[PDB]
Amino acid sequence: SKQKEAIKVYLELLEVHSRVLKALIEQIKLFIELIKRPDEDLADKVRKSSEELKKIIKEVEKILRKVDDILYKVKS
Amino acid sequence: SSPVDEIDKEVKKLEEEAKKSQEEVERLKQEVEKASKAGLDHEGDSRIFKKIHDVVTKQIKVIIRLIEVYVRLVEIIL
Amino acid sequence: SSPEEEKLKELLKELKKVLDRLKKILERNDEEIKKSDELDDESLLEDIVELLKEIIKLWKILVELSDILLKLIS
């Protein structure tokens, strides 16, 4: 059923948002130390965490496309 | 006292809320899996989705508070 | 006020705009689901679509905000 389909989407979002929390907390801590003291190794792992967030964006765009596929078939 | 140290304090508090959120998510995933393996009514699927919706909403609100703290961090150095 | 600082303040005001409308979406979705009993499948996915769109815009601003902050802090 389509209500079970919206359940699968939300479960996917929980797993995604957990990695958003983990990535966002790391970036804030890294900036706290960068503001107190600049360090290139710290700046590098900020760029690494930013790239991880970019891949998460792509995962959320894939979730959205799959939901739009269902909505398009429902409204058809 | 110090503004950056106040933000450091607030992030540690929000980090603990993230840990508690993840713990609640794991309890939900176990209940959903138990509900998936059982023949549920359309009302049973309703209460399950409402349960999942509340956990999703709580988790996003933790993210928003993190971002609002993040914003305060940016405004300090500006 | 400098060019890069103005770019950050513009993105920061856009971030506040996105957060505000995101909280309105969470409230509307929570309000619509609290009607209990049977839930429509179309409106449920449409509410999800609107949530995902703002969530995607949110992360995109955070990614760009992180880049500008690294330029400022050097």
Give the sign of the dihedral formed by CA C60, CA C25, CA A18, CA B69.
positive
Question: B5-24: string of b/e by CB count within 10 Å (b at 16+)?
Answer: eebbebbeebbebbeebbee
Contacts of A44 (CB under 8 A, 6+ apart): none
- Sequence-ordered alpha helix ranges (H) in chain A: 2-36, 40-74
* A47 contacts C45? CB cut-off 8 A: no
**Best residue of B45, B74, B78 to probe chain A, by most A CBs closer than 10 Å:** B45
- Rounded CA separation C28/C46 (Å): 12
- Residues from chain C contacting residue B61 (CB–CB below 8 Å): 26
* A67 contacts C49? CB cut-off 8 A: yes
Which of B64, B11, B72, B7 is closest to A17 using CA atoms? B64
DSSP SS3 for C2: coil
- Rounded CA separation A16/A10 (Å): 10
* Residues listed for chain C: 74
Resolution of the entry in angstroms:
2.1
Nearest to B53 among C19, C33, C58 (CB): C33
